[PDB]
């Protein structure tokens, strides 16, 4: 028969559990968006201490028994990887609109017509969003700082935006590059995020160069150079142990001292081959013996070893240099230049190499002076979001007004097209359209001010044109035009949020059977 | 024939056979080879010096 510990359930209870868990999870992270946001705290299963207010970064930190919540977490990380902001937005949209679907499901409905209503609904509202799409040129720095401040308005570090926002844009350009003249690339892995504890927020900014937490490898080397000569090697200077085994049979009177002489001579010849194209700094990820450094002290090289592989990539990209593997292949074109300034400064109680670029960089490294690793992590996540949106606007010069007004605008548009169409799916259609504006009521709750009157006035104002930009002012719980407030969000972000929430709803509204307790095979 | 302690087939020789367009099958059990001798009349070759058409058969 069937095995013992396998429980199998069906009927209404499974969808009941699904919708209840969906609304539950949506009812734990509601109050974190808009200017009025309330800063959450959570503890990792390990025992760490974190605090954040953006969705998936913390929703990754929950273990659950029910499957639907794991599906929710996967949706959250999908949104995190795709857009990096408004993570809570898609979650709450999915939860509220599933809640709307629930009541309708109770009333004799079957999921086939429901999912058909989703497909037609999403098609219609995406088309409407295309209609209301307006492009704006991306060549203005003031625009980009405005959008960064709009995004960070949901974040508590908005205080320093005046400087901080600008910092973001800097990286977005000073890493920007294109392979062979095409396929423009902006690598965040090349935008290494380093944070030095202590210091005010203002002292933190992007440096037109590369930052590494290392120091000098020998006291008697210069600790400052204006223009060093850059070479990168990927082989150790210590004796290489070959591949096979020989076990030399010392038969004659003496070969051991001869062996040591040959060893030091090989080291000498390779080191002098390196010196042949006179450098000023040699950098390598491998360890180095004393003899190579001693030989380099005649050439006064900086002699830095044991660097990180991605750090090698970043430094090479910034300098524009190349990477060698043999001293013998050393040639001219590989040695890049652009090291406008080099320092080894003692910061706090740790050393850091300060190479400052003079020429064009194609990779950035960040100094982050703060008060604690958790706050620095917060600002790092938020600046990552900043460059994310900056590059998103770079790729697509589209904008629509922020503050959630477009939700109600497209809701009214779908209302009119539901009037145009004929069917019974118009009911769930308009219902999920009403689910769309869960955001503004959430914003009002964050404000804690009057709700119904402003909601109704907003609703009346948006059923006609000329008000689509006009939105909800969360600063003081009022209604204003967004042509002047400044909150503006890219088209692709809201596109992805809409698609993600709708597809999650479509996924969660098909199951009929659950079987639990089976074994991996 | 299936071999132990030693590879009955050589990778370099495998490429050689691939170049010379001959089917290569190894790891054949010790016993039913006589069955094969009874089946298709083939006879074993234990050394390349032994090798001769006398231990080679024909097939359709």
């Amino acid at each position: 028969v069937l095995s013992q510990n396998t429980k199998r359930e069906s009927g209404r209870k499974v969808q009941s559990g699904n919708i209840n868990a969906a609304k539950t999870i949506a009812d734990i992270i509601r109050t974190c968006l808009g200017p009025k946001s309330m800063m959450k705290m959570l503890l990792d299963p390990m025992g760490g201490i974190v605090m954040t207010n953006d969705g998936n970064a913390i929703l990754r930190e929950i273990q659950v028994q029910h499957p639907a919540a794991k599906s929710m977490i996967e949706i959250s990380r999908t949104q995190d990887e795709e857009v990096g902001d408004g993570t809570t937005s898609v979650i709450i949209l999915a939860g509220e609109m599933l809640s709307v679907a629930e009541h309708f499901l109770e009333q004799q409905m079957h999921p086939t017509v429901v999912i058909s209503a989703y497909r037609k609904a999403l098609d219609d509202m995406i088309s409407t969003l295309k209609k209301i799409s307006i492009p704006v040129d991306i060549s203005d720095s003031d625009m980009m700082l405005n959008i960064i401040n709009s995004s960070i308005t949901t974040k508590a570090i908005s205080r320093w935006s005046s400087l901080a926002c600008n910092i973001a844009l800097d990286a977005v350009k000073m890493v920007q590059f294109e392979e062979n003249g095409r396929k423009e690339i902006d690598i965040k892995k090349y935008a290494r995020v380093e944070k030095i504890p202590g210091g005010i927020i203002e002292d933190s900014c992007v440096l037109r160069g590369v930052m590494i937490n290392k120091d000098v490898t020998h006291p008697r080397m210069r600790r400052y150079i204006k223009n060093p000569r850059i070479v990168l090697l990927d082989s150790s200077l210590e004796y290489k142990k070959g591949e096979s085994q020989t076990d030399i049979e010392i038969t004659r009177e003496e070969d051991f001292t001869r062996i040591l002489q040959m060893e030091e001579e090989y080291i000498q010849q390779l080191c002098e081959d390196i010196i042949q194209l006179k450098p000023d700094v040699v950098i390598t990820e491998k360890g180095i013996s004393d003899l190579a450094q001693h030989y380099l002290m005649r050439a006064n090289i900086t002699a830095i070893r044991r660097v990180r592989k991605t750090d090698n990539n970043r430094i090479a990209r910034a300098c524009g240099a190349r990477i060698v593997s043999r001293p013998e292949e050393l040639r001219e074109d590989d040695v890049g230049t652009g090291a406008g300034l080099l320092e080894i400064k003692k910061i706090g109680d740790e050393y850091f190499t300060f190479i400052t670029d003079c020429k064009d960089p194609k990779a950035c490294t960040i100094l982050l002076r703060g008060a604690s690793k958790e706050i620095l992590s917060e600002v790092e996540r938020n600046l990552q979001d900043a460059m994310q949106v900056c590059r998103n606007v770079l790729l697509d010069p589209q904008l629509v007004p922020g503050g959630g007004a477009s939700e109600m605008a497209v809701a009214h548009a779908l209302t009119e097209k539901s009037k145009a169409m004929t069917g019974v799916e118009q009911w769930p259609y308009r219902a999920v359209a009403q689910a769309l504006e869960v955001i503004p009521r959430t914003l009002i709750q964050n404000c804690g001010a009057s709700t119904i009157r402003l909601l109704t006035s907003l609703r009346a104002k948006h059923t006609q044109e000329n008000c689509e930009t006009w939105g909800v002012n969360g600063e003081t719980g009022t209604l204003v035009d967004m042509k002047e407030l400044g909150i503006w969000e890219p088209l692709a972000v809201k596109l992805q949020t809409y698609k993600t929430a709708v597809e999650t709803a479509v996924l969660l509204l098909r199951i009929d059977d659950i079987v639990s307790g089976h074994k991996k095979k | 024939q299936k071999s132990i302690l030693r590879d009955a087939l050589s990778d370099l020789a495998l490429h050689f056979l691939n170049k010379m367009k001959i089917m290569v099958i190894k790891d054949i059990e010790r016993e039913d080879i006589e069955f094969i001798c009874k089946t298709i009349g083939t006879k074993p070759v234990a050394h390349i010096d032994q090798f001769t058409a006398d231990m080679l058969g024909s097939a359709e």
């Binding site: 290392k214 360890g287 070893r305 044991r306 | 132990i4 302690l5």
Partner: protein, 202 residues
């Protein structure tokens, strides 16, 4: 209510029990998590070659002491690497190595009749093992000259001796039968004899 009043007075129902087992198990689970960092500096012998990713401070007292113990360990282990070729001594001397073979040194006393792929593959596996453990005395020979008219249906029989005491036995192919038998399984069996400490899946 009534049950807990019972509990204060009597023990006729059991329901408050066994809630300490999982408690202690979780306590030990959290406790055992510091063993990874307790011996981080106490296991690797290449950490000196791991400069610039292992150094934060050098107290030069316990750490030079660690070099001293490490070098003593290394010299002790590499002074014993003397083997690696299975050898064919004769039956005339046999009494002199069944007994005079050194105390504290394991002896894998292999007996065989060449010709069967069983014995040939076993000889191959042990010879290859000699390349890994040159601290183990391997012996191979023809059992006929070791034991007179020994039954040829009782090969290959593995013998494990030390100080003339049989510690492990593996008699005939009844425990090695099959060409599918491999390197690691032989090493596993000899480890199970108590001579070697390694890890294997099965």
């Amino acid at each position: 209510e009534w049950n807990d009043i019972l509990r204060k007075k009597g023990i006729l129902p059991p329901k408050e029990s066994l809630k300490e087992l999982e408690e202690e198990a979780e306590e030990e689970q959290r406790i055992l998590q510091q063993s990874v960092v307790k011996t981080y500096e106490d296991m690797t012998l290449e950490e000196l070659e791991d400069h610039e990713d292992e150094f934060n401070e050098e107290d030069e007292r316990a750490i030079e002491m660690y070099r001293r113990r490490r070098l003593a360990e290394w010299k002790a282990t590499k002074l014993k690497n003397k083997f690696g070729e299975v050898l064919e001594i004769s039956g005339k001397d046999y009494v002199q190595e069944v007994t005079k073979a050194g105390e504290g040194l394991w002896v894998i006393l292999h007996l065989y009749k060449q010709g069967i792929p069983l014995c040939a593959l076993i000889n191959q596996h042990l010879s290859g093992l000699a390349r890994k453990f040159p601290d183990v005395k391997f012996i191979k020979a023809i059992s006929t000259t070791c034991i007179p008219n020994y039954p040829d249906r009782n090969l290959p029989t593995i013998f494990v001796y030390l100080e003339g005491d049989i510690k492990a036995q593996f008699i005939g192919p009844l425990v090695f039968g099959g060409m599918n038998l491999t390197r690691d399984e032989l090493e596993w069996k000899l480890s199970e004899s108590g001579a070697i400490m390694t890890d294997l899946e099965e």
